Amino acid sequence: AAPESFDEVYKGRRIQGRPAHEHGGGYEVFVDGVQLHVMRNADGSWISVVSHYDPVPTPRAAARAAVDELQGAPLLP
Amino acid sequence: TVRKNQATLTADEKRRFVAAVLELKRSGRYDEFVRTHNEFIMSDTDSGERTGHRSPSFLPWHRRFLLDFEQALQSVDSSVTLPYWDWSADRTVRASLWAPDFLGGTGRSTDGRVMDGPFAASTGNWPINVRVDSRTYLRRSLGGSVAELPTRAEVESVLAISAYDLPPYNSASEGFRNHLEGWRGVNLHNRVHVWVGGQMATGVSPNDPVFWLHHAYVDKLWAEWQRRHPDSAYVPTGGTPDVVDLNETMKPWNTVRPADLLDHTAYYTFDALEHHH
Numbered sequence A: 001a002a003p004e005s006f007d008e009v010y011k012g013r014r015i016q017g018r019p020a021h022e023h024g025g026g027y028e029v030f031v032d033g034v035q036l037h038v039m040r041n042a043d044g045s046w047i048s049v050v051s052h053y054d055p056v057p058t059p060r061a062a063a064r065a066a067v068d069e070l071q072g073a074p075l076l077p
Numbered sequence B: 001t002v003r004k005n006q007a008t009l010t011a012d013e014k015r016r017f018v019a020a021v022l023e024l025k026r027s028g029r030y031d032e033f034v035r036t037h038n039e040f041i042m043s044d045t046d047s048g049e050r051t052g053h054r055s056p057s058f059l060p061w062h063r064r065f066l067l068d069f070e071q072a073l074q075s076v077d078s079s080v081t082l083p084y085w086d087w088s089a090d091r092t093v094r095a096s097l098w099a100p101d102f103l104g105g106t107g108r109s110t111d112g113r114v115m116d117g118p119f120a121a122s123t124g125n126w127p128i129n130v131r132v133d134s135r136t137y138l139r140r141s142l143g144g145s146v147a148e149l150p151t152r153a154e155v156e157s158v159l160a161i162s163a164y165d166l167p168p169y170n171s172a173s174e175g176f177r178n179h180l181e182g183w184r185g186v187n188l189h190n191r192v193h194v195w196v197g198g199q200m201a202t203g204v205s206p207n208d209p210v211f212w213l214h215h216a217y218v219d220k221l222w223a224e225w226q227r228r229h230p231d232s233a234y235v236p237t238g239g240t241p242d243v244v245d246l247n248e249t250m251k252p253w254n255t256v257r258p259a260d261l262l263d264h265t266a267y268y269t270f271d272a273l274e275h276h277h
Ligand SMILES: [Cu+2]
Pocket: A022, A023, A024, A025, A037, B042
């Protein structure tokens, strides 16, 4: 059961999520249309490549955490 | 071949360590360690192949990765060894670790940029090249995303766990490896990455030289655990899909097994390691 999709503007940036050198991928997140690698842990929490050691409950929470971490910076693919 | 507590290094040792790290960066060798680490942390998954993290091989993998890095350092200056950071003791931003003569301090509040020390972007000697976003400067926010580093009492609770690892051999596991890694329990290793912040909180965490000192202490805690539990040893021991068993070889080297890395003394000793008491 993948999480639902989402789409919102968070701190001025568009964050989107959708079910789908890095792992497989059951879910995709984008920050301003650049893909954010995210990964699900066994307990259902999520991390991302810009907050890898810090589980959060949902892919939207990981997208928001990434926007927080980036401080306006473009993501690199 | 002796790994020492960072807090005990002489001015001369700090200088030689910094210079060897900067030379690996200048020559291009450093960034390939950052890249290797990132590939593994982005591919290791709880339900599929996992080798560098979230799995029993987390400890021997990082032990061999640190040995590769130390040998590269020693190719520049044979007197240099990896120091370790006991974050249970040196737990504030005023620790000598974070002085301008060693790793420099925390990042300014505007953009997290480290402004002092040998790795500050303004030196021109530490470009962040292997990166997940556009920023090319070292960042830190010490104590920003989590208030406190683990304490000695918390470390001792984990060292008392007798089983090395347990099925399902991932971030859900009970046992020593996952409590040391930090996905369950009071959280040791993951929480330190979060406490440093900046690139250390990301998949490209070897961009911060403190990465090596953090993992050298995690590696010392594995050695301490072994001394506390001479009757316990690496698991699993054969036939486990997606997980590196004791006598299986490990990527990326392919020629070494967890079995070849359990005894650190074949490669280095510590300034102090208590005997089985
Ligand atoms: Cu992936």
